[PDB]
Amino acid sequence: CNSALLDPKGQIGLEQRSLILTAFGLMLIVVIPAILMAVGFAWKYRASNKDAKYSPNWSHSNKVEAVVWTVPILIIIFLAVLTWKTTHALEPSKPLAHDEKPITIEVVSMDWKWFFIYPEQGIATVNEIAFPANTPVYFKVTSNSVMNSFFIPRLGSQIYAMAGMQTRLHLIANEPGTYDGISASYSGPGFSGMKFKAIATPDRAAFDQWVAKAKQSPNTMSDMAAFEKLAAPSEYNQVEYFSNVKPDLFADVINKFMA
Amino acid sequence: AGGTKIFGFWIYLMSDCILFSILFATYAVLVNGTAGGPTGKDIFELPFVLVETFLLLFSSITYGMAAIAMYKNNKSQVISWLALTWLFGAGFIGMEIYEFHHLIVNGMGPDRSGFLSAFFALVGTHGLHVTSGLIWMAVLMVQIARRGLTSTNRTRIMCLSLFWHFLDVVWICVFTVVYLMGAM
Amino acid sequence: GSVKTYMTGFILSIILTVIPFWMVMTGAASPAVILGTILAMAVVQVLVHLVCFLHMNTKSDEGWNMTAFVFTVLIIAILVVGSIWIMWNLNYNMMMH
Amino acid sequence: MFGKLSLDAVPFHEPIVMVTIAGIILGGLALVGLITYFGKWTYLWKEWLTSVDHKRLGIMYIIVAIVMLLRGFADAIMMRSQQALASAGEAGFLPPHHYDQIFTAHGVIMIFFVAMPFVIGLMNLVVPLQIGARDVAFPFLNNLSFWFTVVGVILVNVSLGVGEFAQTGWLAYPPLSGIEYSPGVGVDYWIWSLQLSGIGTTLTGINFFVTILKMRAPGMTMFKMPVFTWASLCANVLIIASFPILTVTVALLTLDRYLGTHFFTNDMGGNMMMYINLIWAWGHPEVYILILPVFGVFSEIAATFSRKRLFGYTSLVWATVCITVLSFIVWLHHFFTMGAGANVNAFFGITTMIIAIPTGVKIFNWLFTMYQGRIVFHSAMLWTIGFIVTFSVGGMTGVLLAVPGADFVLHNSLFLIAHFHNVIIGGVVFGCFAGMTYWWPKAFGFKLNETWGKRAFWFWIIGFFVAFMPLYALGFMGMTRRLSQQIDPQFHTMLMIAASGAVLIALGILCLVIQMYVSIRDRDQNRDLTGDPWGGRTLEWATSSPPPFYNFAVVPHVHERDAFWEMKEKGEAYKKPDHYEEIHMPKNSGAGIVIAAFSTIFGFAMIWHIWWLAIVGFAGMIITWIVKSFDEDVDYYVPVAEIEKLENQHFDEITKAGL
Numbered sequence A: 001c002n003s004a005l006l007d008p009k010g011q012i013g014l015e016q017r018s019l020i021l022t023a024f025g026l027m028l029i030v031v032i033p034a035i036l037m038a039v040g041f042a043w044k045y046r047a048s049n050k051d052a053k054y055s056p057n058w059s060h061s062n063k064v065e066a067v068v069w070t071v072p073i074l075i076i077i078f079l080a081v082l083t084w085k086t087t088h089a090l091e092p093s094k095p096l097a098h099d100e101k102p103i104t105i106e107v108v109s110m111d112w113k114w115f116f117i118y119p120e121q122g123i124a125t126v127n128e129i130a131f132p133a134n135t136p137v138y139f140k141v142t143s144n145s146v147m148n149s150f151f152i153p154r155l156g157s158q159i160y161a162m163a164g165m166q167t168r169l170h171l172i173a174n175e176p177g178t179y180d181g182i183s184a185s186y187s188g189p190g191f192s193g194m195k196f197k198a199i200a201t202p203d204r205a206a207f208d209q210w211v212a213k214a215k216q217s218p219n220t221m222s223d224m225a226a227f228e229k230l231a232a233p234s235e236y237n238q239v240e241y242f243s244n245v246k247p248d249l250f251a252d253v254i255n256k257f258m259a
Numbered sequence B: 001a002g003g004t005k006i007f008g009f010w011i012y013l014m015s016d017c018i019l020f021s022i023l024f025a026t027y028a029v030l031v032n033g034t035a036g037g038p039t040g041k042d043i044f045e046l047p048f049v050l051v052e053t054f055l056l057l058f059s060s061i062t063y064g065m066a067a068i069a070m071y072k073n074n075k076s077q078v079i080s081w082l083a084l085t086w087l088f089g090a091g092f093i094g095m096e097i098y099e100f101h102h103l104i105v106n107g108m109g110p111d112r113s114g115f116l117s118a119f120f121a122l123v124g125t126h127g128l129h130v131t132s133g134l135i136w137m138a139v140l141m142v143q144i145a146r147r148g149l150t151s152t153n154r155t156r157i158m159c160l161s162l163f164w165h166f167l168d169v170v171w172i173c174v175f176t177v178v179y180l181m182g183a184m
Numbered sequence C: 001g002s003v004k005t006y007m008t009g010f011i012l013s014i015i016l017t018v019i020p021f022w023m024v025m026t027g028a029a030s031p032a033v034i035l036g037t038i039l040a041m042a043v044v045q046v047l048v049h050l051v052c053f054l055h056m057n058t059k060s061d062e063g064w065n066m067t068a069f070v071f072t073v074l075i076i077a078i079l080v081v082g083s084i085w086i087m088w089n090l091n092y093n094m095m096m097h
Numbered sequence D: 001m002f003g004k005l006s007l008d009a010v011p012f013h014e015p016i017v018m019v020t021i022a023g024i025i026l027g028g029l030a031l032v033g034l035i036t037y038f039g040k041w042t043y044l045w046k047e048w049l050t051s052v053d054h055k056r057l058g059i060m061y062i063i064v065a066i067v068m069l070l071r072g073f074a075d076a077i078m079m080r081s082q083q084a085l086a087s088a089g090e091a092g093f094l095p096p097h098h099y100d101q102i103f104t105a106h107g108v109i110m111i112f113f114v115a116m117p118f119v120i121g122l123m124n125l126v127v128p129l130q131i132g133a134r135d136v137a138f139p140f141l142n143n144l145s146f147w148f149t150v151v152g153v154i155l156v157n158v159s160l161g162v163g164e165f166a167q168t169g170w171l172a173y174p175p176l177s178g179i180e181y182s183p184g185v186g187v188d189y190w191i192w193s194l195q196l197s198g199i200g201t202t203l204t205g206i207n208f209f210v211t212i213l214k215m216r217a218p219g220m221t222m223f224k225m226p227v228f229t230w231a232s233l234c235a236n237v238l239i240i241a242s243f244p245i246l247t248v249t250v251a252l253l254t255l256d257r258y259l260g261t262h263f264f265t266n267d268m269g270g271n272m273m274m275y276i277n278l279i280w281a282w283g284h285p286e287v288y289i290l291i292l293p294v295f296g297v298f299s300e301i302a303a304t305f306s307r308k309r310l311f312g313y314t315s316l317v318w319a320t321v322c323i324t325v326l327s328f329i330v331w332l333h334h335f336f337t338m339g340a341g342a343n344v345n346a347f348f349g350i351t352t353m354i355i356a357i358p359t360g361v362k363i364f365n366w367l368f369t370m371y372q373g374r375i376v377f378h379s380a381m382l383w384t385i386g387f388i389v390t391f392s393v394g395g396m397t398g399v400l401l402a403v404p405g406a407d408f409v410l411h412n413s414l415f416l417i418a419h420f421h422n423v424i425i426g427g428v429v430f431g432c433f434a435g436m437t438y439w440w441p442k443a444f445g446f447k448l449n450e451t452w453g454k455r456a457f458w459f460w461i462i463g464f465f466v467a468f469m470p471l472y473a474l475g476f477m478g479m480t481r482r483l484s485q486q487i488d489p490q491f492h493t494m495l496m497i498a499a500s501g502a503v504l505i506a507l508g509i510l511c512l513v514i515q516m517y518v519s520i521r522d523r524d525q526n527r528d529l530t531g532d533p534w535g536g537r538t539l540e541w542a543t544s545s546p547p548p549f550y551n552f553a554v555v556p557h558v559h560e561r562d563a564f565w566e567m568k569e570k571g572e573a574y575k576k577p578d579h580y581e582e583i584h585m586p587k588n589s590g591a592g593i594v595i596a597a598f599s600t601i602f603g604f605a606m607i608w609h610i611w612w613l614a615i616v617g618f619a620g621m622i623i624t625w626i627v628k629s630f631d632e633d634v635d636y637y638v639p640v641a642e643i644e645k646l647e648n649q650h651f652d653e654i655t656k657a658g659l
Ligand code: HEO
Pocket: A027, A030, A031, A034, A072, A075, D287, D288, D290, D291, D333, D334, D352, D353, D355, D356, D357, D359, D360, D361, D363, D391, D392, D394, D395, D396, D398, D399, D401, D402, D403, D407, D410, D411, D412, D413, D416, D419, D420, D423, D424, D427
């Protein structure tokens, strides 16, 4: 009940919790009577019971087999009003109707860690992201290596990370705090250590202090030569800040596979 | 008796038709997968594929005359119509090898420009079935010449008759999608 | 007899191969009509090779040996068109928009 | 001697592997030493190994599946021990190099070499018996189809001892299983274990498709067939139409690793998403092969032990056909989170719920089959009651996962892991153990132990709800699959319950061994004399127990459904014919093992780049195929004296018990 999906902190996660609960309630009208008839008919109609009706030649009924076909169809039809209006509303790569200047965060998967680029701030971070609360966050996710999956379970949806491909994801945090984000797709021996933190600041004043802190680091990523040094195979990487990034570093990760 | 193996081989060719359709689906995604290499128009010489289409077409009418001679009682005519369609089958293999040898020497192999990987995985996979059918035809030619047109030999001709005509149906789909559409 | 059935399936297969080859080599002043005629004559030449060569018939194996081909055509049309439509949307997405 | 074998590939300095290497070798040498002590090497040959009899091949399919069930579980209990230890801060044994080879091997063994031979083995034993057929349509092909699976279980087993297995999961995803991210022989062991077993599995589907359609009894139409044969007919269609997709997709991965081609790479124009489209286009038709004869097994058992006709035969037959058609248009649900459009995810999301409708018709038809019957609480009946409770919970999970909006937070989590361990352990493993108990008197002539059969059931169903129901809660709190080291301490105390649940299932497999040990030891007391221990309905129970190796002196004439039940209702049900005729039977062939012996040499040579042995291995499979074409002595006639002696020693046991 308080396990990051039944207690979400994002608008996508809150609308996905209701989608799970409404689907679970619709399927229980035909699964719970299926379980109860599996035990109720087994107990009442035993071979040791003599008061029960015994009809060995009864194997066809039009008024019974119609109900066997109609009610799973009617559940699926009521689940066909859903799964179309919700798939077109909870889809990634669709901006949320909030209109409060969404912040774009560029995500590059590595072996075996997460590399985050802020193009509008010129700050690059490793295994840590920050964004103000109640603001839309634009995620552009790619991979420098084998397939991963960007996943913050308490904020909402996930999306795959592929080499040379730019997946898109929109998220928003309704409450301030820190949320543990992991990789959902297995990517090798260092897959168990690909865990990051998403720090949702209470306001944009506490977010700008984190950006100003991250540009005081002596490390820079102004060229692709320093990018490939950071792209060395390593496991359980700590939080690292880069003061200066390339203005178009995210395109260079895609263009090294597509060209 | 004999019709069980003929129908059972027809179901295998239906699985083989699904097997070839995966290569057609893989090729259609990787039509534009040229990583700076040659395209379809820079490679496909349509006079060279027109001879290859007629060689497989001549090998299907030739096997059709062998099945007519099987319905007769002429032992020597089945062998003579089987020797001609083996030459047309060998000429189809001998031109696909020459087409593949020209690409590998010139640097257009499967290891470069992975559109070429899907090209070698569809024409080459079709060429393996004709090569497999050529060994089956050569094995069948020595059993009819030794034992005759027995009951078990008549079933093996009809099983290969389904197999050899099926490879011409696939080659119709091969030269339409790959050569004709690629070299417009 | 059956000799004329193989010859009619052989003459028509020549006509259904030269004409698709002739339009591409000449040019025919229209790319859309070329793609229409290539795909139309490929299906007809397959159906010639099923009746005249493979001897497909509804009354062959008590209703079988024909419905197995119709079923596998639908499976291929599910697999080919379905995966092309999936991979087209996967390639229309995952681009630098 | 040549290739990449250099004696350092043997996993020395690793005590976990080296104990199990010596366990197989000393266990195998003890198994070989017992056969030569009793002098049973001449009995395994010419009666079991080269036999084209479908009952002999049906039993040996299960024995391979039972033995691989021991290996596929004993490495799965190491993962429950590792994940319990890795929580609460303790990096114990199983390093990530060692750990990633396990669930790849756990997935491959349990899908292809446990569940597939058990489903095929139940179809190999019962389906020719139910249609009045004396044998399968292609008897030599059925023997060769068995030995290709033995090549599959050999290459996985020698990967533990000679090299290593893959580290990419059970489906060998793109570039992590490529030649630049997996340069070892691990993916090569994965490729040739599935290629050589997959070409033998495809020949099984062709063999049973012609057997049901053409080798039926005279008078039996398609709608007078047994329900298990209808389920086996629709399951073999999925084998024919999906295993060629598996054959191409693994071979396309073979060209990338060997020839250096570009199909699923990221650099030279290859598309890595094309493999996941193709490996799941077979993948969901693969799993409906597992669940369809299970529905046929449970339909026969629920009709037998309720003393009542099967409710809704026409509804159950057409539900099985609708599953077969809809299985090929749902494969996009396994990779909803790839990044497809809204129109693509919602279209395949809707039709994934459509295939749940014919599954729900089958569930409610067995409920009304037991609506007004006399239910006998047999051990095999307990699996049927336990199936409906267990499959409905995990089936409800799958339709919840069919929604792409719900799938965005539950993809590749333990909620997914608990979903398909709910419908395979609940569905297939309960289904295969139900048919193992139900057809044990027909396969061997004696009944299983009833006391240990019920005890083995209660450890399996209660032990499942402790092993995998915490994984439903663990998938909600964000724990993903294939997590090896440094798990979050909030995931502790829920993984400990899941690790404790695997101990109870370990007792259920242990109770299965005790059940087989007591029944073999006490086979002279509970002996099936009449060939029909329960109230049989299908034509398999009309034969003797065991069948007389031709299974029918005279092929029966079928007039209605449940022909053996209608024969007993008519009154006679046991009529000695006035005369017998010679029976055309195939001979046992030494080929099929020799073709399999040259394929496991060819398979081993391709993995270690021994190219000279690969040519000899590949030519060995072709020359043996060519030399098994000049053999004119492939059939023989059973004399009427052998038939009349076996029928006369069966009809007197019928006359002893009243009839
Ligand atoms: C044989 C095994 C098996 C079975 C029986 C099923 C049955 C289903 N499969 Fe489960 N699938 C199976 C094999 C798998 N599927 C998987 C994963 C999986 C996922 C991915 C989820 C995710 O990745 O997060 C989806 C969407 C489905 C869809 C379904 C659906 C809708 C059913 C339905 O058919 C269930 C139908 C049964 C029902 C519905 C209950 C019976 C009906 C009753 C009692 C009354 C009627 C009620 C209704 C119709 C609502 N499969 C995976 C994991 C793959 C991996 O390793 O990555 C495997 C192995």
